[PDB]
Amino acid sequence: YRSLFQDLELKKERRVILDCERDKVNDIVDQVITIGKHVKGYHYIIANLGFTDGDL
Amino acid sequence: NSIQIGGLFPRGADQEYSAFRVGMVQFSTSEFRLTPHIDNLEVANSFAVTNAFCSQFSRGVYAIFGFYDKKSVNTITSFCGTLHVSFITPSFPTDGTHPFVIQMRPDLKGALLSLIEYYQWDKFAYLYDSDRGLSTLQAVLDSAAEKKWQVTAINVGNINNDKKDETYRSLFQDLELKKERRVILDCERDKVNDIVDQVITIGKHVKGYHYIIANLGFTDGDLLKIQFGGAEVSGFQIVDYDDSLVSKFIERWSTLEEKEYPGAHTATIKYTSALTYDA
Amino acid sequence: NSIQIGGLFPRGADQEYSAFRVGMVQFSTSEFRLTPHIDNLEVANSFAVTNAFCSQFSRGVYAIFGFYDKKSVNTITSFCGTLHVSFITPSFPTDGTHPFVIQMRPDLKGALLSLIEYYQWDKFAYLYDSDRGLSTLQAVLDSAAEKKWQVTAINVGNINNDKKDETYRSLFQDLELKKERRVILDCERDKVNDIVDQVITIGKHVKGYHYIIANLGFTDGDLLKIQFGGAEVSGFQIVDYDDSLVSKFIERWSTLEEKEYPGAHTATIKYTSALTYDAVQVMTEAFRNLRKQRIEISRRGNAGDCLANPAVPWGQGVEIERALKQVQVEGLSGNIKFDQNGKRINYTINIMELKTNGPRKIGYWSEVDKMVLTEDDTSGLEQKTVVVTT
């Protein structure tokens, strides 16, 4: 994960639309927390109907 | 030869007690044996402390040992000072010199001063909990005259656990008005945990901020939660684990079953307990 | 129906004990007459404090009175909380809501912050003794955060008296490093007057400096010594000498021989002693109300030793505390009213300024009305000769 988002940093991406199952959704979110890339200036879109079902 | 001694301990300090009995086992000698009088009274009730103190005095113990609150420190100094009974203690160093007050915890503030001197901060917020004593803060203020620092200290310990939430966000939001990049936290292990957690939730563990944890438990703290945030973090350790005697201590410290000595079956140990075992 | 009571007066506080005697005189009544167990012990020595405390506890006194050190606050608080014994003090207030605690000092904090807001200061030094506690420090720092203030607090109080002169020289130079013109003082009056004398010797009593004396008794100090240095000086006062009740009190006060009553034969008085007399009025009238309650409470030395394990307090005193808190009566510091937390409430603290003619009121401070300026300007003395640099 860290390698992945680090790879995203080379493009300096501010915007990603996640498209995953709710479990991996929660995990990836947790990793985003740990790397801290959820400060203002980033944005996310969770492509599923469970957007409320997951923790936010 | 039996040797009676005091043994005050706050409840919830189980690790220090386990390590204490470990000290009783490890260093027992054929010539004589210590005779502990264990007491698990809360330190918050200074009167109760007085009670246990008179109790062990009735025991006629040649020594007394245990933790003390800043609420209790004047009491212990008053009584032990009066009766000329010695009292070793893990807790924070007395702000005033006293007879019969051996104290296991090294003064930490000067190292903190030299530390700031290294980081060369001009200005920074400084959170603090009252319980360990405000004297450290006094010191940082003294230097603030000499070092023209513009520190903004704020207490945190008044807050209830029940509303232990928005007060933080409001607090750091207040820090944002000064746009502070640098804070030296000065809090208890638990408060360290909650504060670090809230910092995570507000995401200020990102690079461009910095932190300094003013205690010996900087390794004891669970910093793994923020290791990857990119913000630099630094603190203190009174006990290197690379030390031979230390590693040897770990070799058996893991071995003990938790049922006999709870909180002992771990790779490491709180430095305070280590101070007990040394004491 | 004489009622046994405590008496814990620290040595050298003669004026206070004399005021206590005057309190015994002014409110003596046929329904009951108080029975002091007066003692003179060091306030710092928590051990001796516990000794006398347990002694009166052996007496089983229904009330206790005396001061306490910040070192000893935890002592008496822990005892009142454990033994459920009511107690009254003129010492500085606890930071926590401690049961069975009565205290004659309204907090000076809010009026102080209000004063700061009145002067609209941004930078200032804050000298302090440790002894009254650091609560005011925590407060001023707290307001300093939100108000973008630049505090320069310093612990003057740890300095040895052996050379209480040398340190000051570097000390004010430290202020000169930032050229501070604004210095809050937070110490007991003796340290206050000493330090002011040092300000004289260094000559910083000159105009353009401003000063704040953080104490209930602003008039108690030797202000006359620097009245004409031109530097502005002002402070809070809980005691209006101009009050007719206070006036009559003076009329009986200075007239008395100081031999029988040391510290009494003067035109002046410590605010502490006034708090003492007020405490006497409050306690006495409280038990007067107890007689209306007719709730008999009389007991022998049933309390015995204080080390009873567990000690089990008698609950009639718990009721007595309720009887105390509900008391609402006028005193030397104006009205006295208590919250169930035991703090004084709905009080007032007059503002004071050192005009060149002498010290002077300009307003008063309710806790709920906050700052309240009074019109009292006496139609303007003079413009005091405006400086004109060029």
Q: Please tell me if residue B229 touches chain A, with a CB cutoff of 8 Å.
A: yes
Residues of C in contact with B72 (CB under 8 A): 74
Answer whether B206 touches A (CB < 8 Å).
Answer: yes
Question: B-chain residues within 8 Å CB-CB of A5?
Answer: none
| Residue A34 Cα, gap to closest chain B Cα (Å) | 6
CA torsion through residues A15, A17, A22, A25, sign: negative
Dist. CA C317–CA C52, nearest whole Å: 19
Report the relative pairing of strands C182-186 and C210-213 from DSSP bridges. parallel
Can you give the C-alpha Rg of chain C in angstroms?
22
> Scanning every residue of chain A, which has its alpha carbon at the shortest distance from the alpha carbon of B231?
A36
Interchain CB contact of B153 with C (< 8 Å): yes
Half-sphere exposure of C338 (CA within 13 A, CB side): 26
Q: Which residues pair with C207 in a beta bridge?
A: C209
Nearest CA-CA partner of B234 in B137, B133, B119, B122: B119
Q: Tell whether B111 lies on the interface with A, counting CB pairs under 8 A.
A: no
Q: Does A34 touch chain B (CB under 8 A)?
A: yes
Pair B9, B39: CB distance under 8 Å:
yes
Residue with tokens 């606050």: C73
Closest C-alpha among B54, B14, B261, B78 to residue B64: B54
Shortest CB distance from B138 goes to which of C45, C79, C155? C155
Hey, of C70, C132, C138, C312, which one would you mutate to test binding to chain B, going by the most B CBs within 10 A of its CB? C138
Cβ-defined contact of A36 to B205 (cutoff 8 Å)? yes
Contact A54, A46 (CB under 8 A): yes
Taking every pair of C-alpha atoms in chain C, what is the biggest distance, in angstroms? 81
User: Nearest Cα to A32, choosing from A23, A22, A42?
Assistant: A42
Q: From B86, B196, B176, B94, select the one nearest B135 (Cα to Cα).
A: B94
Q: In DSSP terms, which residues pair with A42 in a beta bridge?
A: A40
Q: How far apart are CA C279 and CA C265, in angstroms?
A: 21
Which run of H or E residues covers position C361? Answer: strand C358-366
Q: Which residues pair with C352 in a beta bridge?
A: C235, C361
Instruction: Tell me how far apart the alpha carbons of residues B65 and B250 are, in angstroms, rounded to a whole number.
Output: 25
Measured CA to CA, the distance from residue C352 to residue C354 in angstroms comes to 7
CB contact (8 A) between residue C79 and residue B47: yes
**Antiparallel, parallel or unpaired: β C370-373 and C358-366:** antiparallel
Closest alpha carbon within chain B to C70: B74
DSSP secondary structure, C127-184, as one string: EE-STT-SHHHHHHHHHHHHHT-EEEEEEGGGS-GGGTTHHHHHHHHHHHTTT--EEE
Residue that the structure tokens 């002014």 belong to: C26
User: Is residue C52 within 8 Å of C68, Cβ to Cβ?
Assistant: no
Spatial distance between the Cα atoms of A27 and A6, rounded to a whole number of angstroms: 17
DSSP state letter for B158: T
One DSSP character per residue, C92-112 reads PPPSS--TT-EE----SHHHH
- Provide the angle, in degrees to the nearest 10, between the axes of the packed helices C271-293 and C14-26: 30
- Report which of C191, C215, C214, C193 is spatially closest to residue C205, judged by C-alpha positions: C193
Query: Can you say whether residue C371 is alpha, beta or left, with left for phi > 0 and alpha for psi between -120 and 50 degrees?
Result: beta
The verdict on a CB contact (< 8 Å) between B228 and A34 is: yes
Q: Helix B70-83 crosses helix B46-59 at what angle (to 10 degrees)? A: 30
- Cβ atoms C319, C99 nearer than 8 A: no
**Do B52 and B41 meet the contact criterion of CB atoms below 8 Å apart?**
yes
Q: How far is CA C68 from CA C7, C131, C260, in A?
A: 12, 10, 26
Measuring CA to CA, which residue among C319, C318, C338, C341 is closest to residue C328?
A: C338
Q: How is chain B split among helix, strand and coil, in percent rounded to 5?
A: 40, 15, 40
Tokens for B218, please give them.
């900087």
What's the gap in Å between the CA of B229 and the closest CA on chain A? 5
Q: Is B200 on the interface with A (CB under 8 A)?
A: yes
- Kindly state the tokens that stand for C263: 């510290």
Q: Measure CA C123 to chain center.
A: 27
Whether the CB-CB separation of B47 and B57 falls below 8 Å is answered with no
Place of tokens 């010191």: B139
For C224, counting Cβ atoms within 10 Å of its Cβ (0-12 exposed, 13-18 middle, 19+ buried), the class is exposed
Q: In angstroms, what is the C-alpha Rg of chain B? A: 21
Measured CA distances, B130 to B98, B157, C44, C116, C134 (Å): 22, 6, 22, 25, 11
Contacts (Cβ under 8 Å, ≥6 apart) of B133: B70, B73, B92, B95
CA C192 to chain CA centroid, nearest Å: 15
Q: Whole-angstrom Cα distance, residue C37 to residue C48?
A: 15
Residue contact B228–A35, C-beta within 8 A: yes
Q: How far apart are CA B219 and CA B235, in angstroms?
A: 8
Q: Touching check for A38 and chain B: CB below 8 Å?
A: yes
How would you classify residue C370: left for phi > 0, otherwise alpha for psi between -120 and 50, otherwise beta?
left
Q: What is the rounded CA–CA span in Å between residue B74 and residue B89? A: 14
C310 upstream amide cis, omega within 30 of 0 = yes
CA distance B3 to B144: 49
CB burial readout C116-137, b (16+ within 10 A) else e: beeeebeebbbbbbbebbbebb
CB B71 within 8 A of CB B44: yes
Best mutation target, C141, C156, C305, to test chain B (most B CBs within 10 A):
C141
Is A2's CB within 8 Å of B228's CB?
Answer: yes
**C235 bridge partner residues:** C213, C352
- 3-class secondary structure, C276: helix
Which residues from chain B sit within 8 angstroms of residue A39, using beta carbons? 203, 206
Considering only the beta carbons, identify the residue of B71, B79, B142 that sits closest to C74: B71
Yes or no, beta carbons of B78 and C47 under 8 Å apart? yes
B203, B225, B228 ranked by CB distance to A39: nearest: B203
CB contact, 8 Å: B102 with chain A? no
d(CA B172, CA C155): 28
Burial of A43 (0-12, 13-18, 19+ CB in 10 A): exposed
**A9-16 CB contacts, 8 Å cutoff, 24+ apart:** A14/A41, A14/A42, A14/A43, A15/A42, A15/A43, A15/A44, A16/A43, A16/A44, A16/A45
Q: Which tokens is C386 given?
A: 């405006």
B123 in contact with C at a CB cutoff of 8 Å? no
CB spacing of C146 vs B174 below 8 angstroms: yes
Under 8 Å CB-to-CB from B8, ≥6 apart: which residues?
A: B39, B41, B43, B49, B52, B64, B65, B66, B67
DSSP for C292-309, please give it.
HHT------STT--TT-T
Amino acid at C57: F
Residue from the list B48, B75, B153 with its beta carbon closest to the beta carbon of C141: B153
Rounded to whole angstroms, the Cα distance separating B115 from B136 reads 14
First CA to last CA distance, chain B: 20
Distance from CA of C286 to the nearest CA of B (A): 28
Q: How many helices (H) and strands (E) does chain B have?
A: 9, 9
C135-147 and C109-119 helices, crossing angle to 10°: 40
Distance CA C286, CA C278 (A): 12
What backbone torsions phi and psi does residue C295 show, to the nearest 5 degrees? -85, 100
- 3-class SS of residue B162: coil
CA gap C139, C163 in Å, rounded: 31
Decide: C and A in contact? Rule: 3+ Cβ pairs under 8 Å.
no
DSSP percent split of chain A into helix, strand, coil, nearest 5:
40, 20, 40
Question: Nearest CA to C334 among C321, C320, C324, C349?
Answer: C349
- How far C311 CA lies from chain B's nearest CA (Å)? 10
